[PDB]
Design a protein around this ligand. Sequence first.
Ligand SMILES: Nc1ncnc2c1ncn2[C@@H]1O[C@H](COP(=O)(O)OP(=O)(O)O)[C@@H](O)[C@H]1O
Lengths: 500, 170
Amino acid sequence: RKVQSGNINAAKTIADIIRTCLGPKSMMKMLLDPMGGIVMTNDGNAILREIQVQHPAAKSMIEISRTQDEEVGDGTTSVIILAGEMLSVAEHFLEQQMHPTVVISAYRKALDDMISTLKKISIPVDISDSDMMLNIINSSITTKAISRWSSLACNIALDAVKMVQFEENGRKEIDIKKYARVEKIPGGIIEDSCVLRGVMINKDVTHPRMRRYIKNPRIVLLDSSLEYKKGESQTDIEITREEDFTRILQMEEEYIQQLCEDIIQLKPDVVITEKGISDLAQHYLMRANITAIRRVRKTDNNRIARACGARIVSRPEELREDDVGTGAGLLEIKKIGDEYFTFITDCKDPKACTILLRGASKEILSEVERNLQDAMQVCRNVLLDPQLVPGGGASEMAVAHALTEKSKAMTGVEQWPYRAVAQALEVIPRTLIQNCGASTIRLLTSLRAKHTQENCETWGVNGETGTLVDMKELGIWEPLAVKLQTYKTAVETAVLLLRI
Amino acid sequence: FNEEDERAIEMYRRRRLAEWKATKLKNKFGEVLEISGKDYVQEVTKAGEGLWVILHLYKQGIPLCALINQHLSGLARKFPDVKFIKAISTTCIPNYPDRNLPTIFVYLEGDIKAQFIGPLVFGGMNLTRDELEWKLSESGAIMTDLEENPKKPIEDVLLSSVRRSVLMKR
Ligand SMILES: Nc1ncnc2c1ncn2[C@@H]1O[C@H](COP(=O)(O)OP(=O)(O)O)[C@@H](O)[C@H]1O
């Protein structure tokens, strides 16, 4: 019994570590290094990643936040605050009457019916027109930032995240981490920034006499190394027998030329490797008209082989036909930088991409990169679920009111925990009112009355004025996946913590 | 024709004959080794010049010299061409304070490098392996990857804002 009452303290104190950082208006906190240094941090993530704790429950409940942030990328502290608020002042009575299993059973159906109620209300939005998506994105990036060419960044973000799309494997699936790379190069006007249909690499050809400007290439992607020695297998075997060395160097030529002929049996205009290239292999290639690029990273091969134009299965050796034939555009080598840059551009339906932007200084480039990264995250989240739900705490109040009506409707035996959750779910509007700077009790009573009589289909609260206004003319909306994920994650973390 | 191919073959013959003076089986190591006696410096120093060693001094009591051993062994498996040693507080330096217990550093032949002292450099209860390869690879023995430790550079809002304001409109 005393285990739960001991573990709840760590959870509530970690929840209270950061609580006033939510919303537009927020405070800032200070950390003090043991030597004497001072850092004044605003991010919730930085604080809940730096301080280390002891009790295992606190460690697990910290790890949940980062694990969730790894995937969705939108909401981190809200689930922590909601879980702490629910845990603190709901279950301690029910423990005083010694019925934990009844509480869990009530929690399950409470989750089910609140999820159903949330699914009941929704408004669909069309996806054909991009202007209203741009407007929604602009409203979403109203978060604290610098408005320097924000519209351009939003437009490029929308274009890239729409172009990556999906390949009809396991229904719609959008990935942004692996098929989008940002590259920044100083010099030139900031207007020239745009999305590039192909892909850029920072390396160049291995010999000056090979052709560079090619039209309609036929690319082959190949792993492993062309050279083959395998010396470590046979070392110092009858050192006095140099005839063995002569014979092995003679027979290796047969293997090298066999590999070269097997490759050359097709028309692979370009050859990309990763490990290295010897002299016989490049000499044989240069006997014909082929170009080679050496030692590219793994991720670059992942982008290129991802239907950037060069549809290739990336087979190590003994390839087949139709696994090399590809439809691409132009291959070029540029001298824009001190190092030569490779361009494989003007392809068809390229599933990969490469986004580049230009600016005089580097720090403004870093800021612009952060801005468009956030925009891309939001736009990816939107396309998966094309329905929206009003925010500002109105949804929470409506759900709580519906739960109270149901509790007074059927009036089950275990209705007390149900009501406890119902009027313990309303912590967010109280925090918003407290941060605004007005009286909590009167505003909460007015909101309850409005939800009772007007049902508050879109009426909510304003975080910059503190007055009850309708959100139809305000324009505040949020997607649907984030709320469901937050509510679920809170439910199972509470159940898991109570199960011990 | 017969000129270029024969010339290429003969540079292979010359290069392969020049490579006949290669190493002398220096890959004996590749696993974790432990010593605990009076074998202080007569073993670590007495080796070939082209080695890459790493020593370690601990106490076995505090639960920070038990986490680092797993990471060190994991690096031992991946990299075969290095030397790894362990000891318990008494091989050298007969008296040693408990203030800076986990002591890890790299000898070179005649001149030590990259002295790591004290628990503050590691952080504490947060050493993921990647930070360990990064710290060890800041001086040689680099395998790949960069900028994998954002947890150290926390952003200071006020100073960074002042710098951005003074730089953007300068
Ligand atoms: N203009 C606004 N008025 C009222 N509430 C807002 C406004 N803008 C954002 N919010 C609310 O503040 C919350 C802050 O979200 P955020 O800062 O991302 O923290 P988290 O990552 O925990 O969601 C959001 O959930 C949103 O519902």
